[PDB]
Amino acid sequence: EIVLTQSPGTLSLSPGDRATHSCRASQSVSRSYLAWYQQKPGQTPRLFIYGASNRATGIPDRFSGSGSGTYFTLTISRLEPEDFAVYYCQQYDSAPDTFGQGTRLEIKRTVAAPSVFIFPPSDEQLKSGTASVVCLLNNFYPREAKVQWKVDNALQSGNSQESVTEQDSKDSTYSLSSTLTLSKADYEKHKVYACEVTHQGLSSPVTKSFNRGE
């Protein structure tokens, strides 16, 4: 097996910056049978580079590949906001036609604070024994954020889950949903439900709350 090792594992660069993605092989890859793919979250990979340096159909000039032997690169000469992805190299010289582990490229932008919104459980859901409380953080950067749920001012742990959207292809922000899940019995023993958000763009943390049943 030819092992392909990609570096860096993660890369964050701004529009206009030059991005370099490396692919090292454990033995020589002959015939420059080395490809690069772009994969966006939850989407089919697109072939970008084949034969080490050839652009695939529909690939813009800012993407280029180079290399031979054991060392290859994929360059984005001038980043555009639509260029975030995981980039994978693959050799197709000798089976198994192995992939590298990918480099996740994020598009850096200037700090952008989230808008925070809290949504009580719907009447319909409470009917059936469970309460989901949703806290939405909209359109922010960087991706790192801390959401703390408080119930009657007591810090919660273990009863929430979070999910984050892919980067916006035009303005490079993210959005995040946090869902607190309780039994209806537990839900009805408390009054104040609060989501407290800490983020680099907020000079001070922002708390959104409601009182149950109002």
Binding site: Y37, L47, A56, T57, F99, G100, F119, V134, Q161
Partner: protein, 220 residues
């Protein structure tokens, strides 16, 4: 117009089998090596198998030798993966993937999720995330739909039958401790539209043949 269309995936019992098909159009299929590549949830791409243009040479990852078989039908421009003795290690999105020498960006299929599990398809409950003063300022309101307790992936969510697209964020599903998935989809709209425009989320869970339309009504 290059298209690779996969079928044959979905939920399958551990120890069971699936037959994956891939119908190719838009380039000379019979000139190229073809492959299957898979991606386990949250993981990287993994090459599975490939086949020469005439079928006469094929290679496999060791973990599937003797239980997966790659074949092709050049007459029907189709690629196949017959998968047997399936295990949870096989759970992944499977892509048919042309030899990169073809040089076409759009040379992989859309992917089919294979979930190796003894759980049953189960359709979501859909609850509104109603707009209110808490989701509304600066002339815009946020609203949405909580799509809760379904298995397996995936679901699709649209708004107003696809008429509403701007300002939509449909979150990646989270797997709950229950072993069921949940997801929210949210949209930001003009607060002035709340009296006037109807907002409906259209949820399709193909694995359970469940379709739900939920109207999301404003709070005072």
């Amino acid at each position: 117009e290059v298209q690779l269309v996969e079928s044959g995936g979905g939920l399958v019992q551990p120890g069971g089998s699936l037959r994956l098909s891939c119908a190719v159009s838009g380039f000379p299929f019979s000139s190229y090596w073809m492959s299957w590549v898979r991606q386990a949830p949250g993981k990287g791409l993994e090459w599975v198998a490939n086949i020469k243009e005439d079928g006469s040479e094929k290679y496999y990852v060791d973990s599937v030798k003797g239980r997966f078989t790659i074949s092709r039908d050049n007459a029907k421009n189709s690629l196949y993966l017959q998968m047997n003795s399936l295990r949870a290690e096989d759970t992944a999105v499977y892509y048919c993937a042309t030899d990169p020498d073809v040089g076409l960006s759009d040379s992989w299929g859309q992917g089919t999720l294979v979930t190796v599990s003894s759980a049953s398809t189960k359709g979501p409950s859909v609850f509104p995330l109603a707009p209110s003063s808490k989701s509304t300022s600066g002339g815009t309101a946020a609203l949405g739909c909580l799509v809760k307790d379904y298995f397996p992936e995936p679901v699709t969510v649209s708004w107003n039958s696809g008429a509403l697209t701007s300002g939509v964020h449909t979150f990646p599903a989270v797997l709950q401790s229950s072993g069921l998935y949940s997801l929210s989809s949210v949209v930001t709209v003009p607060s002035s539209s709340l009296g006037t425009q109807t907002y409906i989320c259209n949820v399709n869970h193909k694995p359970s043949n469940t379709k739900v339309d939920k109207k999301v009504e404003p709070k005072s």
